[model samples]
Target: DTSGVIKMAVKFDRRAYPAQITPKMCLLEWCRREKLAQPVYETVQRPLDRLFSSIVTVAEQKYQSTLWDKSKKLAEQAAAIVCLRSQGLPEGRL
Candidate 1:
């Protein structure tokens, strides 16, 4: 549940491959294991372009990805990276 998903996600990123696991999945797994509430996410897209930005609220603190992507899921992943890093959990090669 913990190691497998996160490692798979990292493998995908490393190979430039794909995912059955992702940043969102890792975050959810962490929360579930820690007995913490699930995080909340919000996304905003630019009207002039296909760019998306995602914001995540975890443990009453809000974090936004510095990087924006063309999809909400990737943008949320970026946000999740930030959140995870802040908590000293590295997502590895992402």
Candidate 2:
């Protein structure tokens, strides 16, 4: 690697917004000082505290490698179907 910056992907659920980081500036220091903002988007399923863990769930063993984002689009389409079904329009005469 030839980079000076380090990054990590962190995903937190509803009951788990960016709270006070463990004893670090009592938390919110960086967020406040940098004027950082958080996004509030939740229309998918709930109780997703284990979403990512389930995403990578494998019954058998596996080799270590880069994971893929192959299922997200399909998942998005599934969500769209639920949304459309709930609309109760002509196409969704429920």
Candidate 3:
């Protein structure tokens, strides 16, 4: 085997709060307002972290095409969600 050097840096900002509304609460309220199957929310919350991780994993798997495209779109969606919630328009009315 040959000796090699690898340098890596991983940064996680604990202060990050992507949504003013917690993920669980948002999903709950959204389910109620949309009148969709309440069970869908439970399904999503079943393994919340895994669900989010899968999004990132799939995004990486697609890489540079669908992955990158969807990543940006999802980010925009999250930002809009946070903004609407912060503005006291959780359900985006008025």
Candidate 4:
């Protein structure tokens, strides 16, 4: 069996960040580079334990964070990380 040779080239890391790169920043930049719509983050505060849960939608797929947080923004950040990981993208610092 004959297979085509794959070429590997060293390229500059465009995703490199000088400062702390949040998950949200990585997701937004990935979407921007891919010409995709911005990720939609939906968060809800649970009344039972008063915890926040979030789900992020990207390309019509919903992804929830593996962990929960007390704040909506943190939940959103978690969701962003989940989404990015699911899409095989970089999940920077959260």
What TM-score against the true fold does each predicted structure earn? 0.73, 0.23, 0.25, 0.73
Rate residue 69 of model 3 by lDDT: 17
Candidate 4 per-residue lDDT over residues 1-86, each given as its tens digit: 11321111111122544466677788888889989889888887886897887777776677776566777877777777677765
Evaluate residue 34 in candidate 1 and report its C-alpha lDDT on the 0 to 100 scale.
85
Residue 94 accuracy (lDDT) in model 3: 23
- What is the clash count for each candidate, in the order shown? 0, 0, 0, 0
Q: Residue 45's C-alpha lDDT in candidate 1?
A: 92
Better of 1 and 2 by lDDT: 1
- Cα lDDT listed for each candidate: 0.66, 0.24, 0.29, 0.66
- For model 2, how many clashes? 0
Worst 10 residues of 3 by lDDT: 57-66
On TM-score, the candidate that comes out on top is 1
Candidate 1, residue 48: Cα displacement in angstroms equals 0.7
Q: How good is model 2 by TM-score?
A: 0.23
lDDT of each residue in 25-67, candidate 2, tens digit only: 2112333454644211123222444221112101111111122
Taking the tens digit of each residue's C-alpha lDDT, what string does model 1 give over 3-82? Answer: 21121121114243244656677788888888888988888899588888777777767767666677777777877877
TM-score computed on alpha carbons, candidate 4: 0.73
